[PDB]
Structure 1
Amino acid sequence: LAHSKMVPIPAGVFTMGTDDPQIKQDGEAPARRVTIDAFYMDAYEVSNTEFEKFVNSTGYLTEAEKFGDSFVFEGMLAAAPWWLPVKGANWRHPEGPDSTILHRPDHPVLHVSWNDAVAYCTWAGKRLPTEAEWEYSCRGGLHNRLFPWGNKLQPKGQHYANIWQGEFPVTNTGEDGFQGTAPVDAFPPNGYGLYNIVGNAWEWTSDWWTVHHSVEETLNPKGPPSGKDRVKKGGSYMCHRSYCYRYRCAARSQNTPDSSASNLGFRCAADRLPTMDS
């Protein structure tokens, strides 16, 4: 395994957002042309094993551990009736104190806040991606498509991401092979070599959240200078067209930076390769 490996994301200009927004309240529109300098993106969501290396090295206690609770989706035992604050839920105990990560070391780390993610990425010699970098990377070299791979959810009759199948929230059929998370290296890569960029775990980005965007062309944009919530991208194993259609590269949501949940993780980015881990 090389679950901290990065891929080179080429310099380019791309269309961020969409003039055909599917969730208008989220500021998916307007489409705008954005120029991105070449950089590096983690191929994988940060896994439990990789996060454990960080905690072993630094002693870091995550925010959910210090607060003593985190949000867990009821279907695997608040923003919605299916989100419950569970005492003792955290990255090591993703459904609460009687759950474990021992059987899922290669799954994405969960219950990590924005601050926890920044701490990990900086320890790794990296950083969070901006929203524009994240979306450009998600799109995988394709223009104005719904998904990293194109416009069909199941191209060639194949599942390409870990989302929900069945009637949410009562029945997840696990048709795609995974009820909860999947290993970080599951499913096909996109055109840039990224795995699970849509689905699996949601992913923090560095930007403050706003829904007000201009059509002006921009260069390496960082988002607004202030805010109260940080932007997350890409959707999760819970998403379904019927209620939360956020497994599209253009989709976007937000949470306060001290937030954490059982469907929210991250990956890192870097301007240049960090020191080789000998």
Structure 2
Amino acid sequence: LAHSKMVPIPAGVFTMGTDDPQIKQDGEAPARRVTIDAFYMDAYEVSNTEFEKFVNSTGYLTEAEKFGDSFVFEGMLAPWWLPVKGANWRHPEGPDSTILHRPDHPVLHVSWNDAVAYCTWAGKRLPTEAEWEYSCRGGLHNRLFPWGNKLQPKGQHYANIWQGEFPVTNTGEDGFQGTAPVDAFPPNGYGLYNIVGNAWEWTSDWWTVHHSVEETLNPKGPPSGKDRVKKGGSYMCHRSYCYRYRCAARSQNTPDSSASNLGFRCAADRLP
């Protein structure tokens, strides 16, 4: 295992967003050309084991632990999100759940602040939304998914999302009802794993839905806001109610929020 390994994301210009938005309320549009300097991205979502090395070193107590509750999806105990007392990264469905059998799965119940603490501890940082989307797209232009426009290319599952009738029945057809190991599923063109699906991923940007079509260079998002941007979708997503396992998709939460489907990966200017 090399679950803290990074890959070099090459310098380039890409189209961020889409002029064919699918969730218009989320500011997926307009498409805009964005220039990104070469940098490094974690190949994997930060795992339980890797987060435990952080906590072992620093003694860090996560915001969910201090608050004393976190949001858990009802189907694994909106109306299907329940604030559960004693749910946190070590007990992802509440006090009598454990991570001992899933050490290689993504860490969950981590806030934006928790993520920044981890990444900075590791000599890294969160990616910006633009870096994240560029990396997600994996060197392809204007495609829905890291791998192209088909959800199941060659009849193969390429990401851990939902199959079945949400929220009642997850068939587990793709091989995972909850999370999968951080190295599950094929990599995209840049060597990134589970950049769509599995856990949602925090980014550094303040959220807004108002974007210019101006061209930009290493954009950081707006200078203020109340919610931070998260990307990529999770194991809960299904086309029927969600459609957020697209690189262009985007959503938000307050920086002190935490949930059973939300995690992160780090980036860095140079190798730490």
TM-score band by shorter chain is: over 0.9
- Structure 1 residue aligned with 2:181: 183
Shift of 1:117: 0.0
- Equivalent of 1:199, from 197, 204, 207? 197
Shift of 1:178: 0.0
Distance in 1, matches of 2:228 and 2:69, equals: 20
1:169-195 deviation line (CA, Å, top 9, x unaligned):
000000000000000000000000000
Shift of 1:47: 0.0
Map 1:191-230 onto structure 2 (within 5 A).
Answer: 191-230=189-228
| 1:141 pairs with 2:139 | yes
- Structure 1 residue aligned with 2:10: 10
Shift of 1:197: 0.1
Q: How many residues align?
A: 272
Distance in 2, matches of 1:23 and 1:114, equals: 23
Partner SS, residue 254 of structure 1: strand
Distance in 1, matches of 2:271 and 2:27, equals: 33
Shift of 1:93: 0.1
Distance in 1, matches of 2:241 and 2:51, equals: 31
Shift of 1:144: 0.1
1:65-101 deviation line (CA, Å, top 9, x unaligned):
0000000000000xx0000000000000000000000
- Structure 2 residue aligned with 1:65: 65
Shift of 1:259: 0.1
Partner SS, residue 227 of structure 1: coil
- Structure 2 residue aligned with 1:27: 27
Distance in 2, matches of 1:43 and 1:144, equals: 22
Distance in 1, matches of 2:240 and 2:132, equals: 25
Structure 1: give runs of 5+ residues left out of the alignment: none
Distance in 2, matches of 1:241 and 1:179, equals: 16
Instruction: Normalising by structure 2, report the TM-score.
Output: 1.00
Shift of 1:133: 0.0
Partner SS, residue 135 of structure 2: helix
Shift of 1:112: 0.0
| 1:56 pairs with 2:89 | no
1:106-160 deviation line (CA, Å, top 9, x unaligned):
0000000000000000000000000000000000000000000000000000000
Shift of 1:233: 0.0
Shift of 1:12: 0.1
Distance in 2, matches of 1:144 and 1:99, equals: 41
Q: Percent identity?
A: 100
- Equivalent of 1:126, from 121, 124, 127? 124
Distance in 1, matches of 2:246 and 2:167, equals: 20
Distance in 2, matches of 1:244 and 1:86, equals: 23
1:227-270 deviation line (CA, Å, top 9, x unaligned):
00000000000000000100000000000000000000000000
1:14-37 deviation line (CA, Å, top 9, x unaligned):
000000000000000000000000
Instruction: Normalising by structure 1, report the TM-score.
Output: 0.98
Shift of 1:215: 0.1
Distance in 2, matches of 1:219 and 1:16, equals: 12
Partner SS, residue 70 of structure 2: strand
Shift of 1:54: 0.1
- Equivalent of 1:84, from 66, 76, 82? 82
Distance in 2, matches of 1:101 and 1:44, equals: 18
Structure 2: give runs of 5+ residues left out of the alignment: none
Distance in 2, matches of 1:38 and 1:241, equals: 33
Deviating above 2 A after TM superposition, structure 1's stretches of 4 or more consecutive aligned residues are: none
How large is the Cα RMSD of the aligned pairs?
A: 0.1
Partner SS, residue 72 of structure 1: strand
Shift of 1:210: 0.0
